[PDB]
Design an enzyme around this catalytic site. Structure first.
Site, PDB file in Angstrom:
ATOM      1  N   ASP A   1       0.918  -1.101   0.000  1.00 27.26           N
ATOM      2  CA  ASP A   1       0.000   0.000   0.000  1.00 27.26           C
ATOM      3  C   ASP A   1       1.001   1.201   0.000  1.00 27.26           C
ATOM      4  O   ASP A   1       2.120   1.033   0.453  1.00 27.26           O
ATOM      5  CB  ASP A   1      -0.930  -0.087   1.215  1.00 27.26           C
ATOM      6  N   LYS A   2       0.612   2.360  -0.515  1.00 31.50           N
ATOM      7  CA  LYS A   2       1.578   3.439  -0.656  1.00 31.50           C
ATOM      8  C   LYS A   2       1.553   4.393   0.523  1.00 31.50           C
ATOM      9  O   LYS A   2       2.588   4.653   1.118  1.00 31.50           O
ATOM     10  CB  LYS A   2       1.338   4.207  -1.943  1.00 31.50           C
TER      11      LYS A   2
ATOM     12  N   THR B   1      -1.968   1.389  -4.502  1.00 33.14           N
ATOM     13  CA  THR B   1      -2.385   2.561  -3.758  1.00 33.14           C
ATOM     14  C   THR B   1      -3.844   2.874  -4.017  1.00 33.14           C
ATOM     15  O   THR B   1      -4.525   2.213  -4.799  1.00 33.14           O
ATOM     16  CB  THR B   1      -1.545   3.782  -4.111  1.00 33.14           C
ATOM     17  N   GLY B   2      -4.313   3.902  -3.328  1.00 34.70           N
ATOM     18  CA  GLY B   2      -5.535   4.582  -3.673  1.00 34.70           C
ATOM     19  C   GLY B   2      -5.296   5.940  -4.288  1.00 34.70           C
ATOM     20  O   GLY B   2      -6.263   6.630  -4.631  1.00 34.70           O
TER      21      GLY B   2
ATOM     22  N   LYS C   1      -8.863  -3.852  -4.504  1.00 37.11           N
ATOM     23  CA  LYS C   1      -7.660  -4.294  -3.821  1.00 37.11           C
ATOM     24  C   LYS C   1      -7.817  -5.698  -3.272  1.00 37.11           C
ATOM     25  O   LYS C   1      -6.828  -6.291  -2.835  1.00 37.11           O
ATOM     26  CB  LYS C   1      -7.298  -3.329  -2.700  1.00 37.11           C
TER      27      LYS C   1
ATOM     28  N   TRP D   1      24.610 -41.391   6.343  1.00 35.58           N
ATOM     29  CA  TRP D   1      24.010 -40.626   5.260  1.00 35.58           C
ATOM     30  C   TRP D   1      23.880 -39.155   5.627  1.00 35.58           C
ATOM     31  O   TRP D   1      23.859 -38.300   4.738  1.00 35.58           O
ATOM     32  CB  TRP D   1      22.662 -41.219   4.881  1.00 35.58           C
TER      33      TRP D   1
ATOM     34  N   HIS E   1      24.080 -25.903   3.510  1.00 36.05           N
ATOM     35  CA  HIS E   1      25.069 -26.584   4.341  1.00 36.05           C
ATOM     36  C   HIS E   1      26.385 -25.830   4.370  1.00 36.05           C
ATOM     37  O   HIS E   1      27.041 -25.766   5.415  1.00 36.05           O
ATOM     38  CB  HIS E   1      25.304 -28.009   3.853  1.00 36.05           C
TER      39      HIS E   1
HETATM   40  C1  LIG Z   1       3.515 -52.080   3.102  1.00 38.34           C
HETATM   41  C2  LIG Z   1       2.576 -51.337   2.153  1.00 38.34           C
HETATM   42  C3  LIG Z   1       3.020 -49.883   2.016  1.00 38.34           C
HETATM   43  C4  LIG Z   1       4.164 -49.789   1.010  1.00 38.34           C
HETATM   44  C5  LIG Z   1       4.759 -48.379   0.991  1.00 38.34           C
HETATM   45  C6  LIG Z   1       6.188 -48.451   0.449  1.00 38.34           C
HETATM   46  C7  LIG Z   1       6.667 -47.549  -0.386  1.00 38.34           C
HETATM   47  C8  LIG Z   1       5.838 -46.361  -0.874  1.00 38.34           C
HETATM   48  C9  LIG Z   1       6.063 -46.161  -2.373  1.00 38.34           C
HETATM   49  C10 LIG Z   1       6.969 -45.325  -2.847  1.00 38.34           C
HETATM   50  C11 LIG Z   1       7.869 -44.493  -1.935  1.00 38.34           C
HETATM   51  C12 LIG Z   1       8.336 -43.240  -2.673  1.00 38.34           C
HETATM   52  C13 LIG Z   1       9.568 -42.779  -2.555  1.00 38.34           C
HETATM   53  C14 LIG Z   1      10.625 -43.445  -1.670  1.00 38.34           C
HETATM   54  C15 LIG Z   1      12.001 -43.272  -2.312  1.00 38.34           C
HETATM   55  C16 LIG Z   1      12.840 -42.311  -1.975  1.00 38.34           C
HETATM   56  C17 LIG Z   1      12.514 -41.285  -0.897  1.00 38.34           C
HETATM   57  C18 LIG Z   1      13.253 -39.973  -1.169  1.00 38.34           C
HETATM   58  C19 LIG Z   1      14.653 -40.031  -0.554  1.00 38.34           C
HETATM   59  C20 LIG Z   1      14.709 -39.325   0.804  1.00 38.34           C
HETATM   60  O1  LIG Z   1      15.071 -38.196   0.870  1.00 38.34           O
HETATM   61  O2  LIG Z   1      14.323 -40.019   1.962  1.00 38.34           O
HETATM   62  C21 LIG Z   1      15.301 -40.207   2.945  1.00 38.34           C
HETATM   63  C22 LIG Z   1      15.160 -41.607   3.539  1.00 38.34           C
HETATM   64  O3  LIG Z   1      16.068 -42.494   2.952  1.00 38.34           O
HETATM   65  C23 LIG Z   1      15.599 -43.812   2.838  1.00 38.34           C
HETATM   66  O4  LIG Z   1      15.352 -44.249   1.767  1.00 38.34           O
HETATM   67  C24 LIG Z   1      15.417 -44.694   4.076  1.00 38.34           C
HETATM   68  C25 LIG Z   1      16.393 -45.872   4.028  1.00 38.34           C
HETATM   69  C26 LIG Z   1      15.804 -47.117   4.689  1.00 38.34           C
HETATM   70  C27 LIG Z   1      15.301 -48.072   3.605  1.00 38.34           C
HETATM   71  C28 LIG Z   1      15.303 -49.522   4.091  1.00 38.34           C
HETATM   72  C29 LIG Z   1      14.099 -50.274   3.516  1.00 38.34           C
HETATM   73  C30 LIG Z   1      13.373 -51.028   4.633  1.00 38.34           C
HETATM   74  C31 LIG Z   1      12.073 -51.640   4.110  1.00 38.34           C
HETATM   75  C32 LIG Z   1      11.343 -52.387   5.228  1.00 38.34           C
HETATM   76  C33 LIG Z   1      12.222 -53.517   5.766  1.00 38.34           C
HETATM   77  C34 LIG Z   1      11.375 -54.752   6.080  1.00 38.34           C
HETATM   78  C35 LIG Z   1      12.208 -55.788   6.839  1.00 38.34           C
HETATM   79  C36 LIG Z   1      11.441 -57.106   6.984  1.00 38.34           C
HETATM   80  C37 LIG Z   1      10.602 -57.091   8.265  1.00 38.34           C
HETATM   81  C38 LIG Z   1       9.351 -57.971   8.167  1.00 38.34           C
HETATM   82  C39 LIG Z   1       9.686 -59.286   8.878  1.00 38.34           C
HETATM   83  C40 LIG Z   1       8.939 -60.459   8.246  1.00 38.34           C
HETATM   84  C41 LIG Z   1      15.083 -39.154   4.034  1.00 38.34           C
HETATM   85  O5  LIG Z   1      15.745 -39.476   5.222  1.00 38.34           O
HETATM   86  P1  LIG Z   1      17.195 -38.757   5.493  1.00 38.34           P
HETATM   87  O6  LIG Z   1      17.930 -39.482   6.587  1.00 38.34           O
HETATM   88  O7  LIG Z   1      17.987 -38.802   4.221  1.00 38.34           O
HETATM   89  O8  LIG Z   1      17.025 -37.176   5.889  1.00 38.34           O
HETATM   90  C42 LIG Z   1      18.114 -36.350   5.575  1.00 38.34           C
HETATM   91  C43 LIG Z   1      19.044 -36.309   6.795  1.00 38.34           C
HETATM   92  O9  LIG Z   1      18.305 -36.780   7.888  1.00 38.34           O
HETATM   93  C44 LIG Z   1      19.624 -34.934   7.187  1.00 38.34           C
HETATM   94  O10 LIG Z   1      20.908 -35.145   7.722  1.00 38.34           O
HETATM   95  C45 LIG Z   1      19.743 -33.885   6.061  1.00 38.34           C
HETATM   96  O11 LIG Z   1      19.531 -32.621   6.636  1.00 38.34           O
HETATM   97  P2  LIG Z   1      20.743 -31.925   7.506  1.00 38.34           P
HETATM   98  O12 LIG Z   1      22.064 -32.367   6.936  1.00 38.34           O
HETATM   99  O13 LIG Z   1      20.623 -30.425   7.416  1.00 38.34           O
HETATM  100  O14 LIG Z   1      20.662 -32.337   8.955  1.00 38.34           O
HETATM  101  C46 LIG Z   1      18.764 -34.040   4.878  1.00 38.34           C
HETATM  102  O15 LIG Z   1      19.467 -34.560   3.780  1.00 38.34           O
HETATM  103  C47 LIG Z   1      17.589 -34.979   5.161  1.00 38.34           C
HETATM  104  O16 LIG Z   1      16.836 -35.132   3.989  1.00 38.34           O
HETATM  105 MG   LIG Z   2      -2.391   3.193   3.656  1.00 37.45          MG
END
Ligand SMILES: CCCCC/C=C\C/C=C\C/C=C\C/C=C\CCCC(=O)O[C@H](COC(=O)CCCCCCCCCCCCCCCCC)COP(=O)(O)O[C@@H]1[C@H](O)[C@@H](O)[C@H](OP(=O)(O)O)[C@@H](O)[C@H]1O
Ligand SMILES: [Mg+2]
Ligand SMILES: *[C@@H]1O[C@H](CO)[C@@H](O[C@@H]2O[C@H](CO)[C@@H](O[C@@H]3O[C@H](CO)[C@@H](O)[C@H](O[C@@H]4O[C@H](CO)[C@@H](O)[C@H](O)[C@@H]4O)[C@@H]3O)[C@H](O)[C@H]2NC(C)=O)[C@H](O)[C@H]1NC(C)=O
Ligand SMILES: *[C@@H]1O[C@H](CO)[C@@H](O[C@@H]2O[C@H](CO)[C@@H](O)[C@H](O)[C@H]2NC(C)=O)[C@H](O)[C@H]1NC(C)=O
Ligand SMILES: *[C@@H]1O[C@H](CO)[C@@H](O)[C@H](O)[C@H]1NC(C)=O
Lengths: 339, 1108
Positions: free
Chosen positions: B379-380, B654-655, B753, B1042, B1055
């Site tokens: 606004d002015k 402005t007005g 406005k 990581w 960073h």
């Molecule tokens: C069930 C039905 C539902 C299904 C749903 C599933 C999937 C959904 C579909 C699609 C998903 C879509 C996208 C997924 C793909 C990629 C995601 C994008 C990537 C991503 O940034 O995420 C990362 C996770 O990194 C993993 O990946 C995480 C790594 C761990 C992965 C291990 C996989 C485990 C899987 C389960 C194991 C099961 C075991 C079996 C158990 C059952 C037993 C019978 C985020 O954490 P991050 O620590 O890096 O965060 C960082 C960091 O914390 C921080 O230092 C930084 O900031 P600053 O520096 O300033 O501080 C900054 O970089 C920050 O971002």
């Molecule tokens: Mg004014």
């Protein structure tokens, strides 16, 4: 007069500190957790391999045993670990008594004396003790001894609270499905080996003994649960009503474990050490296997500093100390070769 | 029609008019709770948990306790309500400051003006308003202190206008000025209704059985203040909310922010995982119930149907996994955004001392759009300028004179034309010395500053004079002129004087005739009579009108002053030519008749008086030109340069008129030189159509660079804006506006406005801020996302209904860069953490159902899971939320390009939300799978051969899953104060002390019946302490590396800043700006006659007769 103060908290200039992830800081932290974990990750494997046990699967003993004489158990039924090597495989036979009740004698040889205390557990597999219809399903009040009437019973013991307008006394699916198989109190020593008396005193939790008191029921109102009719066929008499305050093997059943494979304590001996030799065990085969479809067993482990032959705690201290010492060298490679 | 009885306190309340009670709080007390349920049910989480607790109340289905999820709902219900009561108190007493303000009110019992507040002003009372006092409500003046009963209102809240308007009372009631003779008022007020049309009004007032017609001339409004008049006598007409100004603006609506619009598209991505993880497990319960019917005889299963035990176990897996949605999210996002709005309103660099007004955040939910601002709709007047003009410099005979000389500009050598500066006392030395050539010119110049205008002086109690000006430009000509000598004093109906203070004598000046300023005339002229008898003509006006009236052979300074007028407006100053002519005695005698023949006529007077001036101002000579400058507020040209480095596009709305918003834009460095304008000010919609079509066509044919994008700006006006806001050309208006740097819009109505704001809100996806003051743009504050108010000493109806109220404009730099880009990062971690803490724990329920035969037994106790959201892990959302600065306050203001992190939303999206959910799965498949390889048969303990049950294992899962979630919060935080050691490594010491107290004391009282002896069998066991050591460290080695690999080998833009913190079409070239703030109906020619200031004050107050 509305001026906010100049305190070092309100202006968000608090005295603060920062994490500098820098390779003169994080790298001497990867050697802080790879030189205090490996002397623990080795100090636990050395105390989980000094545990001497003997596992006998007595599950199918009624089918595959001669009444005549001993034979060897197949290898797929026996696991055993000792300091020295065995000289004969263990032996076993079925014995049907005069009434018509079976019994599965087991004979094994122990290759050296064990100076520590000796424990006898029975391993049950595929028995879903942690099912939701099973853990909460027992009445709390009847264990303490309060004479609960029918209408103020718990609804958690829902299928077996009453049969003919009567109070099923230890109601609940836990006490109904109790492991019957008695274990003989003495390892009877054969071939002039000295026999070994084990006791069953103090096998339960020490806090279960204060909670498990005798009952104040009148005996005319209480029937046994429907899987206890081979022991009390007439019903609960006035003379042999079960004193659950001194029934130790009922207490270690109601302490419900957490997996479909579990141990349960049934015998122990603390004051002495068994010597080397061949011994004998006697087990009555009352509990069938088609009730749950698993494998009841018999183990003779010695208690270590972290349990039995359980290498998982020693290994989980080393996958950490592996990855915290592998990436303690990928620092010094990715720094120097590529700064 | 609405009827008002004058002199009646009783019967005027019968018609049920409103009261002065305004309400700035979003609700009142009576409509608190049923309006509050729509506020709780618009969150999708709290909508979901009411149904779940209803599902828990069918019997024998709950794996937990029957009251745990209504037990943690009523805490969420209450704490989100106790926030609302203290946001009602804080907006009650801040509303009370307007309710309590004073007003003299006629009371017939006392027959005197008594002291009462603004509240009890009934419609129909008679009030009295002193000088520099805001009018309490829309009223009709009766009589006043000035001659012919007039006054002057400053409409800086009603519009953007800088000048003062004359509101003359009707001549019939001019006599009723006496508070004793006021008591004979008899009649009615037949008026119109509330109409919300500012400049139109009708009504007929009858008095003593005689009607009087009214007009918008006889009406003053609510937000206007009364200036340059002792008192007025008002009869109130509207009030409250039914005023002509505050009826269309509603209460503070629920403004859904830009983070909560991503949460409700994240929760829908979590009902997918919740529905899949029922139709993975509960399908499996159907399979294992029938496939193992032989081997499950000990459970006494029914086996009645495949669709009865499905639905008897569809709800069990509904209840057990319903804590995947965090119920403590929509409270700890309110109590961070409330505790951030208390930390913003307590910073000393956001606190204006001179008014003693700290900044205050009323609507505390809109705190995190301050890091995602992409447009600013300012606004002015009131916001940018300080509404104060002071005389800067003057140029005559090709010589410029300024009080302080800049160091770059000096009177150098001429390159064919002399440019530079001189001090003002050197102008006196050429004036006092009678040998110089320019001495008749300077004397003809420095009286032209003192005579030709229409200011009326009034002496103070001190001998210092105070000039009451109709237009505030010429109010700075006299006061700046009197510093140069020739001080203007007493004005008479026929003449003025002027006191030469170095000689002490006063020279009379018989004012013969004076013309008035107009819109299309762009000049005004005053014909004077000197004390010598040689009469004279004066003139001041714009360059494009004064250049066509010269005597070319006479004046030779014309090229020299036009170079200076390209110099003045380049610096941002409002210029004005100053030219005269000598008139003889006979040539006045031929013309002054012809002026009076245009004066005796009645109906063509508005179009013949301006014709009557043109016959006499033909042959003029040129003295020079002056340059008044408008005082911008402090730090305005330094803020706008920083706000354009961060990518924000400033839009001024402005007005005011067009010729002075460009000049303000030149002085604040929005505009600059070498920047051609794109002016669209056309009459009919077709003339806007072609000029819209020509600008887009002239620059879409060729690629113009970003250096050539900064060299362009747009100027539009409100007459041309209503034809580019119809829905057929809205797409064209963006395509020219999305390329230019700055956009100025002028003479924009109070509705338009908002209709510009409601057009860019529904055309792009960018958020946009609105900032201003006064109630002409109170509709703009309710239309934009963040609406900042500026609390002024008068008016401040904008600062009532604004979300953030600030002291002045220069605090917008620290608000949007430091406190804005903190409050976007500080919530985009304490939400992504609060979605992660309820998944590193409550997934070990789901990885448990692959054991226990697809049944749904809860791995932990019922209450210890309900203590997880509320007690042990509610503090690290707070400390991350309010006490974590990722780059400090010195470094964000030093590098303004860091604000482009918050604009694109690189901190909070679904593609980064799923990185915290999947990190919540992998953190739960280690505290589970690491604790079934330990406790393999229950044989873990060394306590004389006893074993670990179901409940002495669930604690080892819970205590490990707390010391991971706290350990993750020690890696995502950036700054470790004394308040971080209390929360993040202190809530661990809370749980390792609260649990042995919970394990020995509370089981005895028939609550939490299990773990009756676990504190013996966990804390004394050597396995429980060697699980808590490595099972965190095994699941944080992925996070600790990581985080390290992101800082060095793939670093982001902030960073290296964090590492820096710890160690270190008209063209403007030939445009000569003309800006005269006078407009028509300042009462220009009537007001010079009926005044005096030598006549002493009247008896009853400041009554002065018309001495004409
Ligand atoms: C069930 C039905 C539902 C299904 C749903 C599933 C999937 C959904 C579909 C699609 C998903 C879509 C996208 C997924 C793909 C990629 C995601 C994008 C990537 C991503 O940034 O995420 C990362 C996770 O990194 C993993 O990946 C995480 C790594 C761990 C992965 C291990 C996989 C485990 C899987 C389960 C194991 C099961 C075991 C079996 C158990 C059952 C037993 C019978 C985020 O954490 P991050 O620590 O890096 O965060 C960082 C960091 O914390 C921080 O230092 C930084 O900031 P600053 O520096 O300033 O501080 C900054 O970089 C920050 O971002
Ligand atoms: Mg004014
Ligand atoms: C070891 O533990 C075993 C399991 O806990 C248990 O084996 C079960 O024992 C019960 C009782 O002896 C058996 O139930 C029988 O059911 C058959 C029909 O299937 C009947 O002969 C009889 O039921 C009758 O039912 C009538 C009306 O329902 C009732 O009026 C009668 O009184 C009578 O109860 C038996 O009750 C069951 O089949 C056994 N096997 C399994 C796999 O469940 C052992 O008894 C127990 N042994 C000891 C020594 O404790
Ligand atoms: C633990 O085992 C030892 C055997 O090594 C038991 O000691 C024997 O106890 C019986 C009790 O009837 C005595 O008759 C023997 O003479 C004891 N043997 C020796 C060498 O003293 C010991 O009692 C057992 N502990 C128990 C049962 O609590
Ligand atoms: C020790 O073992 C023998 C052999 O069966 C038995 O007779 C005796 O009762 C046992 N002693 C005790 C105290 O049980």
């Amino acid at each position: 007069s509305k001026k906010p103060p100049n305190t070092a908290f309100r202006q968000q200039r608090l005295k603060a500190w920062q994490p500098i992830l820098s390779p003169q800081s994080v790298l001497p932290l990867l050697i802080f957790v790879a030189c205090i974990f490996t002397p623990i990750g080795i100090g636990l494997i050395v105390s989980a391999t000094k545990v001497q046990d003997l596992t006998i699967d007595y599950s199918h003993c009624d089918t595959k045993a001669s009444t005549t004489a001993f034979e060897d158990i197949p290898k797929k039924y026996i696991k055993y670990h000792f300091k020295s090597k065995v000289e004969n495989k263990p032996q076993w036979r079925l014995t049907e008594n005069e009434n018509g009740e079976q019994s599965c004698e087991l004979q094994f040889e122990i290759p050296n004396d064990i100076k520590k205390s000796i424990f006898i557990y029975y391993k049950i597999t595929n028995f879903y003790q942690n099912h939701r219809r099973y853990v909460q399903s027992f009445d709390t009040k009847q264990i303490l001894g309060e004479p609960i009437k029918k209408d103020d019973l718990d609804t958690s013991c829902s299928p077996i609270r009453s049969r003919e307008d009567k109070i099923i006394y230890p109601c609940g699916l836990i006490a109904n499905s109790m492991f019957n198989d008695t274990f003989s109190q003495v390892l009877s020593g054969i071939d002039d080996t000295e026999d070994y008396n084990l006791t069953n005193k103090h096998i339960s939790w020490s806090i279960d003994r204060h909670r498990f008191k005798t009952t104040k029921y009148n005996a005319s109102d209480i029937v046994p649960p429907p899987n206890w009719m081979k022991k009390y066929p007439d019903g609960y008499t006035d003379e042999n009503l079960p004193d659950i305050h001194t029934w130790e093997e009922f207490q270690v059943w109601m302490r419900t474990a957490a997996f479909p494979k579990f141990y349960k304590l049934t015998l122990k001996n603390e004051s002495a050490s068994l010597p080397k030799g061949k011994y004998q065990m006697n087990i009555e085969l009352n509990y069938p296997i088609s009730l749950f479809g698993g494998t009841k067993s018999f183990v003779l482990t010695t208690n270590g500093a972290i349990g039995g032959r359980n290498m998982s705690l020693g290994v989980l201290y080393l996958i950490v100390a592996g990855l915290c010492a592998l990436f303690g060298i990928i620092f010094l490679v990715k720094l120097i070769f590529q700064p | 029609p609405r009827v008002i009885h004058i002199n009646d306190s009783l019967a005027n309340s019968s018609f049920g008019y409103s009261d002065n009670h305004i309400s700035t709080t979003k609700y009142n007390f009576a409509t608190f709770l049923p309006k509050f349920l729509f506020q709780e049910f618009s969150k999708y989480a709290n909508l979901f948990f009411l149904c779940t607790s209803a599902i828990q109340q069918v019997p024998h289905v709950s794996p937990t306790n029957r009251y745990t999820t209504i037990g943690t709902l009523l805490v969420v219900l209450i704490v989100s309500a106790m926030k609302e009561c203290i946001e009602d108190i804080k907006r009650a007493n801040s509303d009370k400051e307007l309710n309590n303000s004073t007003a003299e009110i006629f009371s017939e019992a006392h027959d005197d003006f008594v002291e009462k507040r603004w509240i009890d002003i009934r419609v129909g009372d008679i009030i009295r308003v002193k000088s520099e006092e805001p009018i309490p409500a829309d009223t009709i003046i009766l009589s006043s202190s000035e001659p012919e009963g007039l006054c002057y209102i400053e409409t800086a809240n009603l519009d953007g206008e800088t000048n003062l308007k004359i509101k003359q009372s009707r001549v019939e009631t001019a006599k009723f000025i006496d508070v004793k003779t006021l008591k004979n008022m008899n009649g009615k007020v037949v008026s119109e209704q509330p109409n919300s049309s500012l400049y139109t009004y009708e009504g007929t007032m009858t008095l003593n059985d005689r009607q009087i017609p009214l007009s918008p001339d006889q009406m003053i409004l609510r937000g206007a203040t009364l200036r340059n008049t002792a008192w007025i006598f008002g009869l109130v007409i509207f009030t409250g909310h039914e005023t002509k100004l505050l009826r269309n603006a509603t209460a503070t609506p629920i403004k859904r922010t830009a983070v909560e619009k991503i949460i409700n598209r994240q929760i829908i991505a979590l009902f997918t995982v919740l529905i899949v993880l029922i139709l993975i497990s509960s399908i499996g319960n159907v399979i294992m119930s029938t496939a193992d019917a032989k081997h499950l005889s000990y459970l006494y299963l029914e086996g009645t149907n495949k669709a009865g035990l499905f639905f008897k176990d569809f709800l069990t897996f509904w209840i057990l996994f319903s804590n995947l949605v965090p119920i403590s999210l929509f409270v700890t996002v309110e109590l961070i955004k409330y505790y951030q709005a208390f930390m913003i309103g307590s910073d000393l660099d956001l606190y204006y001392e001179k008014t003693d007004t700290p900044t205050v955040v009323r609507t505390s939910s809109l705190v995190e759009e301050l890091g995602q601002i992409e447009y600013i709709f300012s606004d002015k007047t009131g916001t940018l300028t300080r509404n104060i003009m002071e005389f800067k410099s003057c140029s005559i005979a090709g010589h410029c004179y300024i009080d302080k000389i800049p160091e770059d500009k000096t009177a150098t050598v001429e390159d064919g034309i002399e440019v530079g500066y001189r001090k003002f006392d050197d102008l006196k030395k050429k004036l006092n010395d009678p040998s110089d050539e320019d001495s008749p010119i300077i004397n003809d110049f420095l009286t032209l500053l003192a005579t030709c205008h229409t200011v009326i002086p009034e002496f103070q109690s001190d001998g210092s004079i105070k000039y009451q000006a109709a237009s505030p430009d010429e109010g700075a000509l006299v006061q700046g002129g009197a510093d140069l000598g020739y001080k203007f004093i007493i004005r008479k109906p026929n003449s003025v004087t002027v006191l030469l203070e170095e000689t002490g004598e006063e020279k009379e000046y018989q004012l013969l005739n004076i013309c008035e300023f107009n819109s299309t005339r762009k000049r005004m002229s005053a014909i004077f009579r000197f004390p010598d008898g040689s009469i004279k003509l004066f003139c001041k006006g714009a360059d494009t009108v004064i250049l066509e009236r010269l005597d070319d052979e006479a004046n030779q300074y014309v090229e020299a002053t036009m170079r200076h007028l390209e110099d003045y407006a380049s610096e941002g100053l409002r210029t004005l030519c100053l030219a005269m002519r000598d008139i003889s005695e006979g040539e006045y005698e031929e013309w002054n008749s012809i002026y009076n023949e245009a004066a005796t006529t009645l109906d063509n007077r508005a179009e013949k008086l301006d014709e009557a001036a043109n016959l006499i101002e033909k042959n003029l000579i040129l003295i020079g030109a002056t340059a008044i400058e408008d005082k911008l507020q402090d730090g305005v040209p330094e803020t706008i340069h920083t706000l354009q480095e961060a990518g924000i596009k400033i839009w001024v709305l402005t007005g005011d008129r067009q010729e002075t918003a460009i000049n303000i834009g030149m002085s604040c460095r929005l505009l600059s030189e070498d920047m051609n304008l794109l002016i669209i000010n056309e009459e009919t919609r077709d003339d806007t159509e072609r000029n819209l079509l020509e600008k887009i066509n002239a620059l879409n044919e060729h690629q113009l660079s970003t250096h050539d994008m900064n060299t362009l700006a747009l100027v539009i006006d409100g007459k041309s804006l209503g034809f580019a806001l119809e829905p057929e050309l809205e797409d064209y208006l963006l395509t020219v506006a999305k390329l230019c740097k700055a956009v100025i819009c002028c003479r924009v109505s109070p509705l338009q406005k908002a209709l510009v704001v409601k057009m860019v809100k529904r055309k792009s996806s960018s958020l946009l801020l609105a900032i201003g003051d006064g109630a002409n743009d109170v509709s703009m504050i309710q239309a934009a996302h963040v609406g900042v108010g500026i609390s002024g000493m008068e008016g401040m109806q904008a600062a009532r209904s604004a979300d953030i109220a600030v002291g002045q404009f220069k605090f917008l730099k620290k608000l949007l860069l430091v406190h804005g880009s903190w409050s976007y990062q500080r919530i985009s971690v304490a939400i992504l953490y609060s979605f992660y803490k309820n998944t590193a724990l409550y997934m070990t329920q789901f990885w448990y159902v692959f054991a226990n035969a697809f049944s749904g037994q809860s791995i932990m106790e019922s209450w210890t899971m309900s203590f997880y959201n509320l007690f042990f892990t509610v503090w690290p959302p707070f400390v991350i939320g309010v006490f974590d600065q990722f780059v400090s306050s010195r470094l964000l203001e030093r590098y303004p390009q860091l604000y482009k992190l918050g604009q694109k939303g690189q901190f909070f999206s679904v593609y980064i939300f799923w990185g915290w959910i999947i990190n919540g799965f992998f953190h739960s498949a280690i505290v589970f799978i690491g604790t079934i390889l330990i406790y393999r048969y229950g044989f873990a303990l060394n306590m004389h051969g006893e074993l670990a049950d179901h409940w002495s294992w669930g604690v080892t899962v819970y205590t490990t899953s707390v010391i991971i979630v706290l350990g993750k919060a020690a890696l995502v935080t950036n700054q470790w104060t004394k308040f971080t050691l209390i929360a993040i490594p202190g809530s661990l010491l809370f749980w390792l002390i609260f649990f042995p107290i919970y394990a020995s004391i509370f089981p005895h009282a028939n609550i939490s019946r299990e773990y009756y002896g676990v504190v013996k069998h966990t804390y004394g066991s050597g396995v429980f302490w060697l699980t808590l050591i490595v099972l965190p460290i095994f699941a944080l080695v992925r996070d600790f590396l990581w985080k390290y690999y992101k800082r060095m080998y793939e670093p982001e833009t902030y960073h290296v800043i964090q590492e820096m913190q710890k160690y270190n079409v008209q063209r403007m070239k030939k445009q000569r700006g003309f800006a005269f703030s006078q407009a028509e109906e300042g009462g220009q020619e009537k007001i010079v006659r009926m005044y005096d200031t030598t006549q002493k004050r009247g008896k009853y107050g400041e009554l002065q007769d018309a001495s004409a």
